[PDB]
Design a protein around this nucleic acid. Sequence first.
RNA 1: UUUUUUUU
RNA 2: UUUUU
RNA 3: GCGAGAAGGGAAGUGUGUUUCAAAG
RNA 4: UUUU
RNA 5: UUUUUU
RNA 6: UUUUUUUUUUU
Lengths: 153, 99, 198, 121, 101, 51, 125, 455, 103
Amino acid sequence: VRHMFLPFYSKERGPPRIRMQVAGVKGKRFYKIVAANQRDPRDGKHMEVLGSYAPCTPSGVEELRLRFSRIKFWLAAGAAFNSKMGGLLGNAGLVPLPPPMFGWRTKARYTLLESVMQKQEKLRENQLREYFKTAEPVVYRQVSEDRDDVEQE
Amino acid sequence: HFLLGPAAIEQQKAAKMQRGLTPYQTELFMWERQMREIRKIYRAQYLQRLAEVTEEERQKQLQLYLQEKRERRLRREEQLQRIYDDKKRRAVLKDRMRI
Amino acid sequence: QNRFPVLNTAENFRYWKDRGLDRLLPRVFPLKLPAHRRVDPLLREYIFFLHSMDPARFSIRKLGERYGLKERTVELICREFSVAEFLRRTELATPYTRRVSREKAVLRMKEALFSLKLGYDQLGDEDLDEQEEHEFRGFRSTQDWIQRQNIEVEMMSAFPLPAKRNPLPKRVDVDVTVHNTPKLKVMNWIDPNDKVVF
Amino acid sequence: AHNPLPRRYPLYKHRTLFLPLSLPSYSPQPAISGVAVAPLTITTNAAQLPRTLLLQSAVRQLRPLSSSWLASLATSLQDDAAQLAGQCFPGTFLAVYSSDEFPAICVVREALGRVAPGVRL
Amino acid sequence: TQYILNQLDPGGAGRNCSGIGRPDVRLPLAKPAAPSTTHLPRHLVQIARHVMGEAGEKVRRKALSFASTLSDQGFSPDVFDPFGTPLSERSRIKRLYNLVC
Amino acid sequence: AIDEVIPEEIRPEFTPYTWKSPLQKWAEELKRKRLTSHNVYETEVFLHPPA
Amino acid sequence: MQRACEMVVSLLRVDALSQRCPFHVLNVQILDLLQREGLIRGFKVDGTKIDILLKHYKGAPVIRNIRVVSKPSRDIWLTPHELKFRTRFNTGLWIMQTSCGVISHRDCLRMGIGGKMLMAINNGY
Amino acid sequence: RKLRLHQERASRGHIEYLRQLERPPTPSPFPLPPSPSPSSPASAAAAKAAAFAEQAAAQTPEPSVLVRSAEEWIKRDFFFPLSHQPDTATAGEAARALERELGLSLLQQIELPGFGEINVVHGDLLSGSEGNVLAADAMLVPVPPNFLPYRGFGLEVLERGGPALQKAAFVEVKRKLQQREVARDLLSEGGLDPGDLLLTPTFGVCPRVSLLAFLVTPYYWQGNSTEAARRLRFTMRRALDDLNRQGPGSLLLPFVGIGLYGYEPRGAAEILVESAVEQLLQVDAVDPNYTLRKITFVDRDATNAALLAEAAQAAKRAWLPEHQVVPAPVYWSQKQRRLLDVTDGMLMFCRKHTRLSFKKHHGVIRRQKTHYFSNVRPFLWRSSRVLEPPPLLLYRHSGKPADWQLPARPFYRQGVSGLLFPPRLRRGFPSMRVNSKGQFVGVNKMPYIAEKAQP
Amino acid sequence: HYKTWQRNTAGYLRTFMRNKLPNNEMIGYVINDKHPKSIRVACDRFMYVMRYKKTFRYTKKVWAHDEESEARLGDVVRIQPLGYRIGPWKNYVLVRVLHKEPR
RNA sequence: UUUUUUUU
RNA sequence: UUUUU
RNA sequence: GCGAGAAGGGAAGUGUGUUUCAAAG
RNA sequence: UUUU
RNA sequence: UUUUUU
RNA sequence: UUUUUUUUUUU
């Protein structure tokens, strides 16, 4: 069924591809994911808009809005993408998670470091357990009878 | 469930290396082969679902075409009857005046 | 000229309204006040306690039925009570010296004056659920925004008259959440106008 | 590109949000499970009324799936009535019945719903 | 009569009505009248009249079921309520009450 | 079932029942006594203290 | 089409009981719609001219304003979704000429077909 | 079941939103034209023909816009009426097929190990003649008096049984009524009280039923909605309580509140469900006496049955630790907990001088056009107004997303959400068209920025 | 050029339909049939004005081709366009003849 | 009942 | 800039 | 080996553009 | 900066 | 720095 | 102008 994708392909510009754009106001730029050819300009002609991406948001968590019924359809047509694009789509579950830099087999020291961090989090939990039994908003110390408030978050 | 499941991650690591290639290349090529299978799965699914919609739309066109054909045929026939009835009266009346 | 003893007629609509020279006459009106503030402060503590004790047995809806409080009103009582107590136990600041906008300051004065004259309410007086009734709520209530008409004209006949064209729902875009992570938030854009679901 | 706010004496007063909602359909709708869901008044506030909450709740439950001419009319009516009546064996109100004849009418009552649900005797 | 009352006070299934005009309600009538026993079943009353006994057949309710000349919905000396259930109390309206206030 | 309605004063709100909660009964008792007063309730006082 | 616009002058009279009108095929159909709404007491075809009666109430006539939209030199057409905007919050009577005969503006929107605005009866601005 | 893949969960929300917007059709009957029409012959013929066109207009769904040429559409609009079932009204075959695989095309069971055996909500016939056709204590909801005027489930039951059953019912009530009068007279409201129970052995009503209880229920028209709910809870609790120290534990309460006393499937439903759980656990009991360990609900009505199921789900939440949901934004915050010590000197800058606060700069815009092309257009990349979606709900223990969650939040301009003459949009086949051969082909064109903003 | 809002009015749509024909066909009357196997068809078109809301008419004389030379002067015929250029003047092809003038 | 009315 | 009178 | 006018206003009036369709080197 |  | 004040 | 929320027609 390659006949159905003929129009999409452009001889002058090139084959279709998926990338991002840079638009908005100076100082508050936001990424916009669209579909275009290879030689097309970064900000110009576009075939279809897939979504957007906001790496900086007031809440502090990166947002990502995408179309689940369009990305899968475009991939079947034979549309490539950059390395960075694959990583973001992998987390969403649309495509297999690509390997990180230097591969996975070399990730030897990180495995041990991650275990230490996980162990510390579990140990910290045990510490706070006892606190709830004798929670004291106001706790002094044997220095100058100074007041020290305690609050969780 | 295999490509998108945890089994895909461990599959890339368990691969045979080749002389003259970096460790990252072995996993990259293995991942590329997996990406080729997902494209076919989506293509097959889209075509199968599109076929159902195409057949449903075809039935609507046939029903609409038949309904419009009957409406025009009946309306046209009624108009012709009025003209034919009136034309006959004029022809016979005109000959009467000549005599 | 006509007989219609009911309370939903053209003349009876918006009863006790100035129609004539009395429109310019100054008239005093009662001052509105939210229900969550007219209740006895004492009962607020009690209600909060229950909520914080056993949310399962004492649900948001069941708790408000006994005291006659709406689901939305009861939620604010716990939220406003929590913050007041938090600053006292922790020895942070007094409620009186708390910073707040001017809109709330005037509201506090009315609450104190409301009780000084009449008194606090021991139990709320409001219905949990709404009821379809004929009332005047703004200028957008007595208007048809679909057909954009004020006066309906129909043919007078005893035989069954053909029905009117029913309206269709408006299709608009919405968003949903699929995967949420501490360092990333993925969302899906829904397009109801798309024929192919896939 | 605008932030409406009061700029007059009445700067602090109750300002409830109003959401006009006209009739959804002019056709006559039946009662859902015996509870009437017909529109009584056109004035509707933003808060959803309990009567309307029932209709919308059931909407989401429904799944998307699923010679002369005069002589012929009477000929088919008799055949259809006889055929349907014989399936139960191998509307208007005001149907009286005696105490000792309850079994005779009980079977008939329950048998009309299998071939004519519209009957409301 | 039913239609007239419906317009004066909207009331039905799933709605809070004032109970004015219903058979099971006490009203301040100008003159005494018998209850509306027309809606009660005839099979259950007839079978219950014998098992109730003389205590609840001539001294409980029938002792005052025909004391007044007037009646409601005609007359029915055979059908009545042997049990002494008082259908007192009423409900306030939501339309007229809000106008006077 | 309706006839000539004679004006009669009733108090449906203040009607003790076997299903009302203990708090409701208490609250209604105090409120009822306040409205029935004919010496303090039905009076207008300018100053707060009995000057 | 020219004879259609000549009916407004005759029907728009105060101190009169009956007025004549030229006979036309299209004019006969228009009078039928007006009579249904209760605007014309009656009419009769007197051969080369049609005699149309006038309706009055408390002195003043039932018709107070007539606006001619369509003219022989041009043609006004409105889509089903555009007629509603034009005609809104009014009690006026607009004659619509659809393919399936002649009907009022109220019926044109019900069918959703594209009509043709001929004239206006009891219309303001 | 248990959709683990992200793609499966994403598609679930799409179907739910489309189902709400979908409404089945309702063709209205058309009256026959009158034969003795007083109109002129020219108008009579046109009117008669127009009647038939309207009938087929509402019973002939139109195809996609892309099917026929543009020219065709224009001619049809001015020659035929507009259909009542446009192509953009109902979902296509694609939506129906997806639900078959996802699993969306015995209802509920609340099981508690140790207290309550099971809580099955199976809906079926009671007296049609195991889950729902084996018990030993049947329930009934008669009118306050001992005579049912009309309607009511109990009306059928009593008549079915014949005079044999009826005789036992009148004797039991007579003795109970007399006992109350004597007890309230020697030691010092002459009618019955809502919340009483009466026992009556079965007389052939149902072979698989031993007992037949008689629980009175109150009315709904008395008082407001807030007062009505309070009354039902009192009767339920008293009924359940008495049943406990009565006999064996087997409750077959079909549905309480239904009949002719006023019912609300939405509100009334929650009362019942919520009440059942408490009985099992016997919360309100100093001395636990576990006797009742089986509660079931039976409903004939399909519609009602479905609704009942919903209630069950809500009941299960906030009660069992295995089904306790928690918003994602607060779930992660609660995990990485810390103890922060704040001294008196750290709150120096927190305090402020001014007491009150308010906006010191009016939001009155000066330039409508200059501001729009500087701080509105760049920040707008969509042609539709969409608000922030609600947060995702996750579990507490397992920390995984749940199936049931809040629905979408569609937005409407000026509140009105009704279109009478919807146009034929071109969004049905994005970047796809029909060729001369009939096949589907793509296109190469720049999309319109205001495509969705021009309905 | 017409604006986006000008393509949805009934006035413009009606004019478009009249001008639009299958295979971009046209209707006109022959005015010159002197050269062999040649006939000049005079077609009439329409246009819409968004200022005064009035439609006018303007003639469009074009050249056509005939094989059997059946058409004659003053005879309404049907023309069909072609995706090439044949002859110095010939730009159309005949299909049929609707009306025929006596001699 | 709080350095509340009260205002860099 | 300075800051519990 | 591959990419590169990414800094072009000099030509044209019924043209440059827009719209409707079509295109299995 | 009465959050750089 | 004074006056008033659930 | 929302304590523990990044959600809120806050007013």
